């Protein structure tokens, strides 16, 4: 298997780990802060997905420093992940087009 496909795969597996640790970590940081809503694992996991996708419902988000830190990591991990898939896709098309041109 080519690099770009392996990397993409890797990024996905890595993202899923970050989603999970993120959820856990988020709860850990958020409990104790008055008025925090990011305080149970299940929604925390939903919060991590939307965070990774940069979706934006705003139904949930962190209010503590560490919570937000964890958040930044999930955002980055997510954007990088999805951007890497795009690169992978671009590389695929580029290679095929070259073929279709005889190169």
């Amino acid at each position, epitope marked *: 298997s080519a690099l770009h496909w392996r990397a993409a795969g890797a990024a996905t597996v890595l993202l899923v780990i970050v989603l999970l640790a993120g959820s856990y970590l988020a*709860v*850990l940081a958020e409990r*104790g802060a*008055p*008025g925090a809503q990011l*305080i149970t694992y299940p929604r925390a996991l939903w919060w991590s997905v939307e965070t990774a996708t940069t979706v934006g419902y705003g139904d949930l988000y962190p209010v503590t420093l560490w919570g937000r830190c964890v958040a930044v990591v999930v955002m980055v991990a997510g954007i990088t992940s999805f951007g890497l898939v795009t690169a992978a896709l671009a590389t695929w098309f580029v290679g095929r087009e070259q073929e279709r041109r005889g190169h």
Partner: antibody
Amino acid sequence: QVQLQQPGAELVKPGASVKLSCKASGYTFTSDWIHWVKQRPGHGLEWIGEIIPSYGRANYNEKIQKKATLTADKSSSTAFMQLSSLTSEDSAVYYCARERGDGYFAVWGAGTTVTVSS
Amino acid sequence: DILLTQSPAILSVSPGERVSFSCRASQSIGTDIHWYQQRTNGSPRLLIKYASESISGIPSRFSGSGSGTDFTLSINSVESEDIANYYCQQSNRWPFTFGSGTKLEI
């Protein structure tokens, strides 16, 4: 089988301190939090604080004077609440409970009756 | 912090009659409300989770409804074993909090 085991009672002289215990059994997850709830005779339930054994961090009710300090022993599956410098106001039944990180207390201990008297 | 108001403090009902406990939250908390039963000298026992979810082991007689700020715990055809104190507890925001309770009287 009884998931949470707590001592029936503890007698404490005014000013002294006591350490209550809560031995847990059954399924244990890294996401488990152990809670402590105080209940004075004839009155309602009052949340004291929580602790997550897998990490060891604890949170406490800010609305009330902090009389407790929570700790946990992973090897023995036991959670401890140290109540210090007690008075008659601290006399009550103290329950410990288990929350699977999903917001509700699935199970409670039988509670420990604490009496502050000379 | 979220304040849970349980009124009336005492509810009187005739046997076999349907009864409804009320729990109002100081602010919208979705359905993250949970109910517990506490009989004389006993420990609290989960009856309903997330406002309306049933708990295995609990009589089909118990049911919950409500979302937002107004929640209700209902008992169809009350019976003696139902005599106890009833509390609501929210887990929507930190820290978790409990209602002041309501006593069922037959």
